[PDB]
Design a protein around this ligand. Structure first.
Ligand SMILES: [Cl-]
Lengths: 154, 29
């Protein structure tokens, strides 16, 4: 696991190792933010705030633990504060966010984590503080809701 | 609807929009 080695180095004070974690995970954090409809005026800020908090909290992180799930727990909490207030192409991006925005919050978060950033069901469950079975249930609900929405919009 | 195909599209759209992440300004902190 490349991330485990990088995280251990970052926790020991290596800002260059931390920079590599930012390079590896920053796109996926911003993707999630955009999926949640956070304004472009705020996406870069949230992503920055998430990594700055992660850096300062590395002292309380066991580097053997999965880094992405820990990082996304920080990130999602910061995103939740903002996305309630979500407002060329990208008319395409607005369409994606507005469709996902019609999902109830629980199924929106699970589908963004799994289908958009690419987390496994157990990884998403770890981020969300849910059982893996709860995640599997929410995914089913989300897919059913999306199918209807897409049927009605075509 | 083909939910899988749409999610693939959503993933691509959000990613292409998010390529310009600024590692430097994060390091500036
Ligand atoms: Cl899975």
């Amino acid at each position: 696991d490349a991330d485990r080695i990088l995280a251990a180095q970052a926790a020991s004070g290596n800002q260059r190792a931390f920079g590599q974690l930012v390079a590896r995970h920053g796109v996926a954090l911003a993707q999630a933010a955009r999926s949640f409809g956070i304004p472009e005026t705020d996406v870069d800020d949230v992503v920055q705030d998430t990594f700055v908090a992660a850096w300062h909290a590395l002292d309380d992180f066991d580097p053997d633990r999965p880094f992405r799930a820990w990082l996304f727990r920080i990130g999602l909490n910061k995103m939740r504060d903002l996305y309630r207030f979500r407002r060329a192409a990208r008319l395409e991006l607005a369409r994606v966010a507005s469709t996902l925005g019609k999902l109830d919050t629980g199924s929106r978060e699970v589908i963004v984590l799994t289908a958009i950033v690419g987390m496994s069901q157990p990884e998403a469950a770890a981020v969300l503080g849910l059982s893996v079975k709860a995640v599997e249930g929410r995914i089913g609900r989300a897919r059913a809701k999306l199918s209807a929405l897409l049927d009605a919009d075509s | 609807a083909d939910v899988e195909e749409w999610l693939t599209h959503a993933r691509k759209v959000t990613q292409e929009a998010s390529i310009g992440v600024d590692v430097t300004s994060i390091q500036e902190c």
